[PDB]
Amino acid sequence: FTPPTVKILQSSCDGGGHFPPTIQLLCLVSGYTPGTIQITWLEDGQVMDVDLSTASTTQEGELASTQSELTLSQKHWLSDRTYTCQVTYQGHTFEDSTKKCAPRGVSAYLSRPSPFDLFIRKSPTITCLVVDLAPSQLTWSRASGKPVNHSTRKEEKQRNGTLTVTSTLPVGTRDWIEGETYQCRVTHPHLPRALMRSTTKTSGPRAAPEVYAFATPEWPGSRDKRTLACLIQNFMPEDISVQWLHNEVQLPDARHSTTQPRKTKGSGFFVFSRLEVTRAEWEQKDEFICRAVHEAASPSQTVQRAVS
Amino acid sequence: TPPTVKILQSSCDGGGHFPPTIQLLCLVSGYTPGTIQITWLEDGQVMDVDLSTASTTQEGELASTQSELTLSQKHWLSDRTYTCQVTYQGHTFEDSTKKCNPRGVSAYLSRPSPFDLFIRKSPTITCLVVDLAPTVQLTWSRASGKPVNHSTRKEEKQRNGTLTVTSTLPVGTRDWIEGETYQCRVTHPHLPRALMRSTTKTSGPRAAPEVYAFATPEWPDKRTLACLIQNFMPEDISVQWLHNEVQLPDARHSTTQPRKTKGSGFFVFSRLEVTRAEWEQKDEFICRAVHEAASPSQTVQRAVSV
Amino acid sequence: EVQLVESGGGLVQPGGSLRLSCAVSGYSITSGYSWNWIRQAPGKGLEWVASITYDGSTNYNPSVKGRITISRDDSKNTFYLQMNSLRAEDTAVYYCARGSHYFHWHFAVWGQGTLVTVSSASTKGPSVFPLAPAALGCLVKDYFPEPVTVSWNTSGVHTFPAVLQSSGLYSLSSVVTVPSTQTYICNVNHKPSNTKVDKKVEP
Amino acid sequence: VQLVESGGGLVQPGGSLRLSCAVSGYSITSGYSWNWIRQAPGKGLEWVASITYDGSTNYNPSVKGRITISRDDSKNTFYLQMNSLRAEDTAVYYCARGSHYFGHWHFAVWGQGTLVTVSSASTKGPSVFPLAPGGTAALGCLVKDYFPEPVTVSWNSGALTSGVHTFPAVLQSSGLYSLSSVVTVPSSSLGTQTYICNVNHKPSNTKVDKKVEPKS
Amino acid sequence: IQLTQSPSSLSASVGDRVTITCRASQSVDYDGDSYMNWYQQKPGKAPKLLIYAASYLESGVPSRFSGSGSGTDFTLTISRLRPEDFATYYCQQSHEDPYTFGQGTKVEIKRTVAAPSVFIFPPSDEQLKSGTASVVCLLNNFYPREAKVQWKVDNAPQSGNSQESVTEQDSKDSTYSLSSTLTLSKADYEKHKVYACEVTHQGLSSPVTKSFNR
Amino acid sequence: IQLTQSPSSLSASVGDRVTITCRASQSVDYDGDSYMNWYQQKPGKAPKLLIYAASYLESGVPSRFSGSGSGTDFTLTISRLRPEDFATYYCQQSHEDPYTFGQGTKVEIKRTVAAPSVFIFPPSDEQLKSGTASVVCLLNNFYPREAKVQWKVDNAPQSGNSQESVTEQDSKDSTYSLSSTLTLSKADYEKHKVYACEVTHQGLSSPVTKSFNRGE
Ligand SMILES: *[C@@H]1O[C@H](CO)[C@@H](O[C@@H]2O[C@H](CO)[C@@H](O[C@@H]3O[C@H](CO[C@H]4O[C@H](CO)[C@@H](O)[C@H](O)[C@@H]4O)[C@@H](O)[C@H](O[C@H]4O[C@H](CO)[C@@H](O)[C@H](O)[C@@H]4O)[C@@H]3O)[C@H](O)[C@H]2NC(C)=O)[C@H](O)[C@H]1NC(C)=O
Ligand SMILES: *[C@@H]1O[C@H](CO)[C@@H](O[C@@H]2O[C@H](CO)[C@@H](O[C@@H]3O[C@H](CO[C@H]4O[C@H](CO)[C@@H](O)[C@H](O)[C@@H]4O)[C@@H](O)[C@H](O[C@H]4O[C@H](CO)[C@@H](O)[C@H](O)[C@@H]4O)[C@@H]3O)[C@H](O)[C@H]2NC(C)=O)[C@H](O)[C@H]1NC(C)=O
């Protein structure tokens, strides 16, 4: 045998979130061995008018179904009343209630190792950022069970009445290169089922980038300043770092500008680097190295090209 | 017999709470048994049936096909426009729905692109209205007092229940240079009000754009060209590629939006891939920048050969 | 930037003609905006009288219609207003105004303006009698018509409006405070009677 | 990476069996988990053994005490030696690898699975007999009177795969297993194409190739 | 079309809310757009435009101003009053030619009360021979403007012979200025020895007068 | 830690939705998460990992699979039903020891009825010298499994001395194949001439039988 089950559905809205002029609720009594059944509707506990609801019983095979539809106006449905559908099955009554749909949303971002931290610096770090927490324990994990280097948990509340928890986990050099996977989970007193943020190596293949460096000609009225444009394209995936070098010393990131990686016409991504130089720099040494750090480059994940 | 589309959803809790997963049902009423295609659309994008269930029932002569979509509690709170698209016998039947109040109606006046201004010889200002609720006649105005050229009106309804108005007015080139100001207002049957947005030539000093064309070296039937347009104020600019005395399509070359330089002015890069049969017909590819500060004809260009 | 200055005032006999002038600098008129005159009576409100568009289309006001006319000149980059049969109501201060279109207009840039006196009285000059004293000043008694500019050598000074004496002449006073070795000189310039008076005040 | 088992067969009751698992692609000493999972014939699955990269082991309560598991770093292979074999100990052993998750593991990679049958009956090789025959014809081979399982069957050294139906073996009245394997081919290809079934019984080292030609 | 401004004049403390009403006789709007403007007329210069369409602000106009209304009733609201924005403001419709203006609303700035300082100076030696004797009782830096100066010629009440002149709010001391000019004949100036004007004002507890001997 | 699934065997139409419930006697919600795994064991192959922690899908698994539940009760949901999913499904828990698998759920597919294919195979001359005789009756690609096969040697009904076997559903068309084997003594074959095999199935409105004579 099989006892019946009860479910309630409401009418849908439009693209603008507008309720229809007549709101309709449905009470499903599906999947039950044929037997005596009677549906009764309630409004905050009171039995509604019998002429407002219609009940149709359909029998299919060994199970039975019973449908009950109720048409209400928008003013009555917007009253936030508790409408209970009480269906009786041979003495066993099942109930279910509904009401008009009346906080803040949690989010989390887990950054990936930057090419500078993994190959040039040699101290790769990931950042598990969790935002929009109600101000009132972080739990890291690894996929291979290897010894997890501990992280610094920086818990700081935000200005919008929320809380942010920054967790920077140091990882190994060879581990991320060989495709290690890490996961991040935070626990809060008001959490029944926590969420998970898992970072790993990119699913796509690898392709070394091609670096071309050009020097803009002297523009009329700008004899003491040149612009250096560097094109780096056809590299997969898009995670790449760019830096410039003059006189064997690396320039800060504020002196150059790099665009976001965008797809090429076929396969790979392309970026553009723009460095502004003065006449004292190229007369000191007319050589500027446009260096690109990518996981697919080799041997030391580095590809460069100079321009005069 | 055409089918009837109807959308339902899971009922909320008696205390005004949302269930953990909001499910949307798309009922199709009685119709002549035939090819029915229930495609679920989220903001106009196609969903895969590997997430929505399809069930067909045929009783006597009428058919009843229903599709149920499983959604999380967070996605229903995104106020995205969900759509159950049903196609039968050729003609389509679409029913849209969204999460569920007063809210303001906004609009923006679009500046005419220098491509329409200096190159296409048809500079067009665009008064676009968004988030409107049901004649809707649009009217333009000039500050100098001269009558406006009649603009084409175009109404367009969206899936989010909004209605948009597209007004394209051919303006004069000399007026935009001298500093003409255009305005826009709409009389709507819904609200007794009429808003206004205004556009004009961007104020502030002007810097002429610097055009630089380069070519990647030949390495062992395809070459990649680059163009750097930098140090121009304001950021209003249009980038095109000329080849064989014919303007190349915009979808052929990749061009970035204007971004501020390290100092004063903006900079734009452009990437174009040419085939071997192109520079054999004419080994001359021109990167032309269309900016209001350029001289003499608001045009500065450079040629490059491979 | 673009500014407007008016000219063409002074004592006018009743029932005569008044030719007003306002020079336009910075923009043209044929391809420009709307141009009009706005007058205000001594101590009263403002009343629009005459207007002209960029193409030359004119529109006037019925209160002084038939006795006024506004014209323009393409070479002088200016326009002119001509009035006749001036009655005592037509005695006012004429301002130069430029408007901007809205679907309905509104005047954005204005002119300095000029004052025109229409009466049968003669042009009396400002008899300057100094006032010995701390504060000092120069008295301006019995002059016609208006206005009168009283310069000094400005800080802590107050120039009073001229009293309308029964004789049809006006009398004003001017004061300024000084701390209790320097000589103060007042400069009274009269526009209609072209009289400039330098007066030194001694204790 | 792939996990391949080796060392199955027939073992007398209470004896000692050594099951190996040679991994390929990943060094067994680089940090991972390696487990053994068995499945009773016709019943559910059950875990028994586990070993980590550093050497930590664990044993299920139902089989602890009868099991010895160790690793070998030189060959990237770990073994499972087990004594005191019982009648209810016969199961298909799968060499699997788990992944870490806050101290909880789940088997990601699964081996090919080897069947170990613990019994007192002796080994018996199969006898192979052909099955000779509308518009579609049918032909097959017979694998009769053998013990124990399993048997691998192919056709034309793997050239014929479409329409192959290898029926599961049945326990005959004599206590031995019997198995039929047939394949449906168009009737036009009877006198043109040659059909040969490949039979291999690893527990008895028996490899037989019998040809099937129509009878007329 | 005629406009009735409300009120005709007002005063308020520094940093208050300024509200001006203007009643239109007929509907000056069309298609929903409010067709009416507002201006600022400060003394000693030319008027300056504030906003148009009764709400839309122009560039170079202070953001502290705000306009509201539609049809026949319009309202002009200032966020806070600055000590350098005193002027008279007018409403003006543009639905039908000719254009008309309102009655005018004078906005006065308020401060602290100060007593008047009066100095009296007789007509000079060159004015007595001119047949007209002009005596001026000048008061400076007083507040409020509501004040009265009584002329006393030989301790006798003088009525109808006083010409009072008033100045507006100063840009340096933020006060007012009044000048009491008495026009007497040359024969009347000789028939008196002691002259005096009693300046009555709120900043003075008792009416303070100034006297001089001819 | 006893685990149970439901139901055991079900027949669903192509493209429907499937619901499986892994009921546990142990609440596994710990550290703010649930630890429960799902697996798919294709017939006769290694089990395939589907869901870990009862919520997250395995990298590379199609989106038709969707898991739900927490604590003691869990629910599995199939979006669209493809024939590629014919297998038995088990749920494994890694929360506490001992690690236990479910009972399994043999999910077979309902579809349109397919006509069976009947074939008869005489015992080869080699088997006759071996002292045993086996006539083979074959059923090929049909639905459903419910069928009756009756043996008839020289028009005499046979029973008790026959053995039948069925295959698993195909990954392409989800059909069945049946093989019926006759077991007789050598003298019984040499004494009878006409051999036939009759089968009963709902796919054909009339049963079909094929016959032959030995040594012909
Ligand atoms: C209360 O207020 C706080 C403070 O604003 C809010 O917290 C912010 O939340 C936003 C979004 O929720 C966060 O923005 C995210 O920042 C990430 C940081 O990434 C860094 O590293 C990458 C490496 O490539 C850099 O490129 C990047 O510039 C950063 O330096 C971004 O990675 C995120 O990007 C993702 O979304 C964008 C959306 O456009 C996509 O384009 C991306 O591809 C990517 O998918 C994202 O931008 C922000 O960092 C938070 N700030 C802080 C201080 O924590 C709270 O959300 C707010 N709460 C409420 C309830 O309103
Ligand atoms: C219901 O759905 C409709 C869809 O039709 C929505 O309407 C869209 O509203 C957005 C508002 O953000 C419009 O985006 C705006 O476009 C303006 C014009 O840009 C033109 O040119 C670009 C290319 O240069 C085209 O890609 C674009 O389509 C237009 O043709 C921009 O000028 C606007 O920028 C202004 O707002 C942004 C807001 O982030 C600021 O950052 C800017 O500085 C600037 O102030 C803006 O980007 C979009 O164009 C509308 N759709 C269409 C088809 O035009 C409704 O909003 C939506 N309603 C609801 C309630 O959901």
Concatenated DSSP letters of D142-180: EEEEEBSS--EEEEGGGT--TTEEEPPPEE-TTS-EEEE
Short-list D160, D83, D114, D112, CA closest to D2: D112
- Which residues of C are less than 8 Å from B183 in CB distance? 102-103
Q: Which long-range contacts (CB under 8 A, 24 or more apart) does C67-70 make?
A: C70/C36, C70/C37
Residues E90 and E123 in one domain: no
Tell me, which fold does domain B99-201 have in CATH? Immunoglobulin-like (2.60.40)
3-state SS, residue B291: coil
Closest residue CA from atom 4 of ligand 2: B158
* Token code pair at residue A263: 């797809």
Q: Does domain A5-98 have CATH number 1.10.357.10?
A: no
Using the mean position of ligand 1's atoms as its centre, give its distance from the Cα of residue A161 in Å. 17
Contact assessment for residue A1 and residue B84, using Cβ atoms and an 8 Å cutoff: no
Residues F115 and F205 in one domain: yes
The last residue of a domain, from among F110, F126, F144? F110
**A185 vs D102: CB contact, 8 Å cut-off?**
yes
Return the CATH architecture of domain B202-306.
Answer: Sandwich (2.60)
Torsions phi, psi for F177 (to 5 deg): -135, 135
Cα-based distances in Å from B222 to A212, B218, B247, C198, E46: 16, 9, 19, 89, 69
Q: Does E84 touch chain B (CB under 8 A)?
A: no
Residue-number span of the structural domain to which E66 is assigned: 1-110
CB atoms within 10 A of CB C154: 8
Which of C105, C107, C129 minimises the CB distance to E124?
A: C129
D43: region left, alpha or beta (phi > 0 left; psi from -120 to 50 alpha): beta
Q: Which residue of E has its CA nearest to C137?
A: E121
Tally of CA atoms within 13 A in the half-sphere of A261 that contains its CB: 17
Subunits adjacent to chain C (3 or more Cβ pairs under 8 Å) = B, E
Distance between CA atoms of residues B182 and B175, nearest Å:
10
Residues E4 and E105 in one domain: yes
Which of E47, E92, E165 minimises the CB distance to C160?
A: E165
* Pocket lining: B168 vs ligand 2, CB cutoff 6 Å: no
Lateral strand order in the sheet of A107-110: A107-110, A125-133, A163-170, A152-157
Contact assessment for residue F51 and residue F68, using Cβ atoms and an 8 Å cutoff: no
Residues F124 and F60 in one domain: no
DSSP D26: S
Which of F31, F53, F70 minimises the CB distance to A187?
A: F31
Contact assessment for residue C97 and residue C112, using Cβ atoms and an 8 Å cutoff: no
Please tell me the total count of domains within chain F.
Answer: 2
For E18, residues 6+ apart whose C-beta sits below 8 A from its C-beta are E10, E12, E76, E77, E78, E81, E107
Residues F121 and F198 in one domain: yes
* Pocket lining: A73 vs ligand 1, CB cutoff 6 Å: no
**Nearest CA of chain B to the CA of C176: how many Å?**
45
The last residue of a domain, from among E88, E110, E132? E110
Contact assessment for residue A22 and residue B103, using Cβ atoms and an 8 Å cutoff: no
* Pocket lining: B62 vs ligand 2, CB cutoff 6 Å: no
Using the mean position of ligand 2's atoms as its centre, give its distance from the Cα of residue B43 in Å. 15
Distance between CA atoms of residues E129 and E174, nearest Å:
38
Polymer length of chain D: 216
Using the mean position of ligand 2's atoms as its centre, give its distance from the Cα of residue B284 in Å. 37
Is there a cis peptide before residue C145, judged by omega within 30 degrees of 0?
yes
Which method was it determined by?
X-ray
E contact residues 44-73, partner B, Cβ 8 Å cutoff: 53, 56
Which of E52, E121, E140 minimises the CB distance to C131?
A: E121
Q: Does domain A107-200 have CATH number 2.60.40.10?
A: yes
Residues F19 and F103 in one domain: yes
Cα-based distances in Å from F138 to D140, F14, F196: 10, 27, 12
Residues F21 and F120 in one domain: no
DSSP string, F182-205: E-EEHHHHHH--EEEEEEEETTSS
* Token code pair at residue A307: 């321009």
* Pocket lining: A111 vs ligand 1, CB cutoff 6 Å: yes
3-state SS, residue A116: helix
* Token code pair at residue B219: 């390495």
**A145 vs D102: CB contact, 8 Å cut-off?**
no
Burial class (CB in 10 A: 0-12, 13-18, 19+), F182: buried
Lateral strand order in the sheet of E88-93: E9-12, E105-109, E88-93, E36-41, E48-52, E56-57
**Nearest CA of chain B to the CA of C79: how many Å?**
18
**E33 vs B194: CB contact, 8 Å cut-off?**
yes
Using the mean position of ligand 2's atoms as its centre, give its distance from the Cα of residue B107 in Å. 9
Q: What share of chain E is helix, strand, coil (3-state, %, to 5)?
A: 5, 50, 45
- Interface residues of A toward D, Cβ cutoff 8 Å, are 139, 141-146, 183, 185
CB atoms within 10 A of CB B264: 11
Subunits adjacent to chain E (3 or more Cβ pairs under 8 Å) = B, C
- Which residues of F are less than 8 Å from A188 in CB distance? 32
**A194 vs F33: CB contact, 8 Å cut-off?**
yes
* Pocket lining: A162 vs ligand 1, CB cutoff 6 Å: yes
**Nearest CA of chain E to the CA of B183: how many Å?**
12
Q: How many CB pairs under 8 A join B and E?
A: 14
Residue written as token pair 């018509």: C145
* Pocket lining: B164 vs ligand 2, CB cutoff 6 Å: yes
The answer to whether chain C touches chain D by having 3 or more C-beta pairs less than 8 angstroms apart is no
Residues F178 and F132 in one domain: yes
For F5, residues 6+ apart whose C-beta sits below 8 A from its C-beta are F20, F21, F22, F23, F89, F90, F91, F102, F103, F104, F105
* Pocket lining: B166 vs ligand 2, CB cutoff 6 Å: no
* Token code pair at residue D194: 């040659």
Q: Which residues pair with E184 in a beta bridge?
A: E133
* Token code pair at residue D162: 């479409």
CB atoms within 10 A of CB C163: 19
Residues E159 and E57 in one domain: no
Residues E214 and E118 in one domain: yes
Tell me, which fold does domain A210-307 have in CATH? Immunoglobulin-like (2.60.40)
Domains of chain C in start order, with CATH, are 1-120 (no CATH), 121-203 (2.60.40.10)
Q: Does domain B1-98 have CATH number 2.60.40.10?
A: yes
Which of B14, B161, B263 minimises the CB distance to A99?
A: B14
Report which ligand 1 atom has the smallest distance to the Cα of A112. Answer: 23
Using the mean position of ligand 1's atoms as its centre, give its distance from the Cα of residue A128 in Å. 12
DSSP E121: E
DSSP B76: H
- The CATH code of the domain that includes F20 is 2.60.40.10
Contact assessment for residue C157 and residue C174, using Cβ atoms and an 8 Å cutoff: yes
Q: Where in chain B is the domain with CATH 2.60.40.10?
A: 1-98, 99-201, 202-306
Distance between CA atoms of residues A140 and A183, nearest Å:
6
Q: Where in chain A is the domain with CATH 2.60.40.10?
A: 5-98, 107-200, 210-307
Contact assessment for residue C24 and residue C1, using Cβ atoms and an 8 Å cutoff: no
With helix as H, strand as E and coil as C, how does F136-154 read?
EEEEEEEECCCEEEEEEEC
Lateral strand order in the sheet of D152-155: D152-155, D195-201, D206-212
Residues E166 and E77 in one domain: no
**Nearest CA of chain F to the CA of B48: how many Å?**
9
**E56 vs B194: CB contact, 8 Å cut-off?**
no
DSSP D53: S
Closest residue CA from atom 36 of ligand 1: A109
Report which ligand 1 atom has the smallest distance to the Cα of A164. Answer: 54
- Which residues of C are less than 8 Å from B139 in CB distance? 103
Torsions phi, psi for B171 (to 5 deg): -100, 170
The last residue of a domain, from among F110, F144, F172? F110
DSSP string, A63-98: EEEEEEEEEEEHHHHTT---EEEEEEETTEEEEEEE
Resolution in A: 3.7
Contact assessment for residue D121 and residue D147, using Cβ atoms and an 8 Å cutoff: yes
Distance between CA atoms of residues A145 and A168, nearest Å:
19
